[PDB]
Amino acid sequence: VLYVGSKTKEGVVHDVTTVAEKTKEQVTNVGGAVVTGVTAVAQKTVEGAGSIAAATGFVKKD
Amino acid sequence: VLYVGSKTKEGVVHDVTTVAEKTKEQVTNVGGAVVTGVTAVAQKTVEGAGSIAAATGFVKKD
Amino acid sequence: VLYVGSKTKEGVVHDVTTVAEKTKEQVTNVGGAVVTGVTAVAQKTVEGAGSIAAATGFVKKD
Amino acid sequence: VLYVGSKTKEGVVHDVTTVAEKTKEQVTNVGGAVVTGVTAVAQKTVEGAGSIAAATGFVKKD
Amino acid sequence: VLYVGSKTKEGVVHDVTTVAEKTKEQVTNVGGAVVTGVTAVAQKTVEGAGSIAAATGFVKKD
Amino acid sequence: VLYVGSKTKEGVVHDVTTVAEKTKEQVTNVGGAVVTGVTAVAQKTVEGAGSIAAATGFVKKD
């Protein structure tokens, strides 16, 4: 194996643009999970049994 | 293996731009989790059983 | 293995830009977790059973 | 005018790959110009009368 | 004018890769110009009358 | 004018990779100019009349 003048990009996030203007936003939350923002997760390896990799807005009442 | 003039990018986040202007935002939260901001997680390796890698807005009432 | 004039970037976050102008933001929080800011986590290795790697806005009532 | 999370690329050259293997190449040159290599020119502005912008393999016997 | 999380690239050259293996190359040159290598020129502004901007392999017998 | 978390790249050269292996190269040169190497020129402004900006392999017998 050999790379010459190359580029590898395993597991990335880029160029996320969010323009929000003139916004009203009310939220009442009891017990649950409210997610209103921007999220960006970048993982190469996530190993494991029962694992929860990159949860967002999660409610687990086991 | 050998890299010449190369670039490797395992597990990265870049170029996240969020423009917010003229914003009102009210939040009442009891017990739960409210997430309104910008998040960026970059991990190469996350190993383990039952592991929770990069949770965001998480409520676990086990 | 050998790298010549190379660049490796395992597990990084860069170029996170957040412009916020003219913002009102009220938050009442009882018991839970409110997360309104910008977060950036960069880990190469996170090993362990039941581990919680890079939690953000977390409520655990086990 | 305003750019948000943008990219401008006025006048560029990129991703020029030339693989040459097992090559014999003889050149005799008298008076003239022999050009056998790879060239990449990138200019934003070249102004002027009679100007010669980015000549390659040029012979001028005025 | 205003740029937010932007990128401008007026007049650039990048990612020029030339792999040459097992090459014989003879050159006899009398008076003229022989150009066998890799060249990369990057100029933003070149102003002037009669100017020669980025010549490569040039013979001028005026 | 105002830049926030930005990048400007007026007049640059980058990521020039030249791998040469097992090469024989003979050159006889009388009077003229032989150019066999790698060249990279980066100028922002070159002003002037009759100017020669970034010549490479030049012979001028005026």
CB C18 within 8 A of CB C40: no
| Beta-bridge mates of residue E57 | none
Resolution (in Å) of the shown entry?
2.4
Query: What is the C-alpha to C-alpha distance for residues D37 and D20, in angstroms, rounded to an integer?
Result: 11
Question: Which is nearest to A40 in space by CA: D60, C32, F15, B43?
Answer: B43
Beta strands across the sheet bearing D56-60: D56-60, E56-60, F56-60
Nearest CA of chain B to the CA of D4: how many Å? 8
Query: What is the C-alpha to C-alpha distance for residues D7 and E9, in angstroms, rounded to an integer?
Result: 8
Query: What is the C-alpha to C-alpha distance for residues E34 and D33, in angstroms, rounded to an integer?
Result: 6
Q: How far is CA D36 from CA A15, E34, F17, F19, F36, in A?
A: 40, 8, 18, 17, 10
**Cα Dmax for chain E:** 55
The distance of Cα F48 from the centroid of its chain, to the nearest Å, equals 19
Within 13 Å, how many C-alpha atoms sit on residue C28's CB side?
8
Nearest CA of chain F to the CA of E2: how many Å? 5
| Beta-bridge mates of residue F17 | E17
- Strand residues in F1-62 grouped as ranges (E): 3-4, 7-8, 12-30, 33-35, 39-47, 52-53, 56-60
Question: Which is nearest to B40 in space by CA: B11, B2, B13?
Answer: B13
Tokens of F10: 């007026």
In order, the DSSP letters of A1-62 are: --EES-EE-SSEEEEEEEEEEEEEEEEEEESSEEE-S-EEEEEEEEE-TT-EES-EEEEE--
Report angle CA A35, A40, A42 to the nearest 5 degrees.
Answer: 135
| Beta-bridge mates of residue C42 | B42
Contact E15 A4 (CB under 8 A): no
Say whether residue D4 is in contact with chain B using an 8 A CB cutoff: yes
In order, the DSSP letters of D1-62 are: --EES-EE-SSEEEEEEEEEEEEEEEEEEESSEEE-S-EEEEEEEEE-TT-EES-EEEEE--
Q: How far is CA B42 from CA B11, B45, E58, F49, in A?
A: 6, 9, 51, 53
Contact E55 D50 (CB under 8 A): no
Query: What is the C-alpha to C-alpha distance for residues F3 and E6, in angstroms, rounded to an integer?
Result: 8
Nearest CA of chain B to the CA of E5: how many Å? 6
Query: What is the C-alpha to C-alpha distance for residues A56 and A34, in angstroms, rounded to an integer?
Result: 9
Query: What is the C-alpha to C-alpha distance for residues F54 and F43, in angstroms, rounded to an integer?
Result: 9
Residue type, B62: D
In order, the DSSP letters of A23-39 are: EEEEEEEESSEEE-S-E
The distance of Cα A17 from the centroid of its chain, to the nearest Å, equals 14
Question: Which is nearest to F41 in space by CA: F19, F20, F11?
Answer: F11
Question: Which is nearest to B33 in space by CA: B52, B8, B57, B55?
Answer: B57
Buried b (16+ CB within 10 A) or exposed e, F34-59: bbbebbbbbbeebeeeebbbbbbbbb
Of B20, B26, B49, the CB nearest to A26: B26
Question: Which is nearest to A48 in space by CA: C53, C59, B41?
Answer: C53
SS3 (DSSP) at E5: coil
What is chain F's alpha carbon radius of gyration, rounded to the nearest angstrom? Answer: 18
Query: What is the C-alpha to C-alpha distance for residues D52 and D41, in angstroms, rounded to an integer?
Result: 13
Task: Report the neighbours of C using a cutoff of 3 or more CB pairs below 8 angstroms.
Answer: A, B, E, F
Query: What is the C-alpha to C-alpha distance for residues F16 and C36, in angstroms, rounded to an integer?
Result: 43
CB neighbour list of residue E62: distance below 8 Å, 6 or more residues apart: D60, D61, D62, F60, F61, F62
Beta strands across the sheet bearing F3-4: D3-4, E3-4, F3-4
What is chain E's alpha carbon radius of gyration, rounded to the nearest angstrom? Answer: 18
Burial of B54 (0-12, 13-18, 19+ CB in 10 A): buried
Beta strands across the sheet bearing B52-53: A52-53, B52-53, C52-53
Beta strands across the sheet bearing C39-47: A39-47, B39-47, C39-47
CB D38 within 8 A of CB D17: no
Task: Tell me which chain F residues have a C-beta less than 8 angstroms from the C-beta of B5.
Answer: 15-17
What method was applied to determine this entry? cryo-EM
Task: Tell me which chain C residues have a C-beta less than 8 angstroms from the C-beta of F17.
Answer: 5
Burial of B28 (0-12, 13-18, 19+ CB in 10 A): middle
Within 13 Å, how many C-alpha atoms sit on residue A21's CB side?
1
Task: Tell me which chain F residues have a C-beta less than 8 angstroms from the C-beta of D44.
Answer: 10-11
Which residues of A contribute to the annotated binding site for Cu cation? 14
As a residue count, chain E comes to 62
Contact E40 D40 (CB under 8 A): yes
Query: What is the C-alpha to C-alpha distance for residues B29 and C29, in angstroms, rounded to an integer?
Result: 5
Q: Look up tokens 């014999």; give the residue.
A: D24
- Residue B42: other Cβ atoms inside 10 A: 30
